[PDB]
Amino acid sequence: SMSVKKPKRDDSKDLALCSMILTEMETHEDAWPFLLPVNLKLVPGYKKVIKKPMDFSTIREKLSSGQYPNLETFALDVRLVFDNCETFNEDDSDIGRAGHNMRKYFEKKWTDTFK
Ligand SMILES: CNC(=O)c1scc2c1OCCO2
């Protein structure tokens, strides 16, 4: 509360570390469904169903331009990618399995880096 604060965590490396995690996810061989925005004109159903589209290149652009106020807002966009994937894709599909794999890959990096 006013004039009463927990000891100050060093956050000066967060921007660089999030960038490294995102790089490692961009180069995973199961990244291909997530590299670019889903084409809303070519994929029937997607625009109406998926209210907040998100993908790795959009995340990279936001990160590089100071549009994430902190650690948590970055992780929320990453999770949003895989939440969208689950909504639109059957678990038993190549893209469905790619989503599950990438989420697991992300959460491990996240834990080891910050938690
Ligand atoms: C995460 N990706 C998707 O949910 C979808 S839906 C249709 C697609 C695609 O990824 C790119 C190939 O075409």
Side-chain angles (χ1 to χ4, degrees), residues 1-7 9-12 14-71 73-114:
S1 71
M2 198 193 313
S3 300
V4 180
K5 302 294 174 186
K6 287 194 196 58
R9 172 183 178 271
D10 181 15
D11 62 340
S12 63
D14 287 6
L15 182 59
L17 290 168
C18 283
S19 185
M20 289 177 49
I21 292 173
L22 182 58
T23 291
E24 299 171 358
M25 293 217 298
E26 286 161 338
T27 66
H28 192 303
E29 67 161 304
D30 291 346
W32 57 269
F34 313 109
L35 290 175
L36 292 173
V38 171
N39 189 328
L40 295 176
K41 292 191 292 299
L42 295 178
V43 184
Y46 206 85
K47 191 174 198 292
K48 185 54 183 280
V49 171
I50 303 295
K51 305 300 171 182
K52 301 170 183 181
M54 189 53 58
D55 71 283
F56 292 170
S57 72
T58 301
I59 291 175
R60 170 69 70 191
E61 181 64 32
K62 289 171 74 168
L63 192 64
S64 298
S65 57
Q67 298 191 47
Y68 292 119
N70 60 64
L71 266 194
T73 61
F74 170 79
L76 282 164
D77 261 4
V78 176
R79 290 167 185 149
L80 174 59
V81 170
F82 305 129
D83 292 352
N84 290 347
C85 183
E86 287 203 42
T87 294
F88 202 82
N89 296 272
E90 307 181 51
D91 288 338
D92 183 21
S93 70
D94 291 277
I95 294 178
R97 285 185 290 275
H100 288 296
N101 285 348
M102 292 304 301
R103 181 197 297 274
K104 181 63 173 171
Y105 193 71
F106 169 72
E107 297 295 352
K108 165 96 154 102
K109 306 276 188 192
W110 192 250
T111 293
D112 299 352
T113 303
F114 297 115

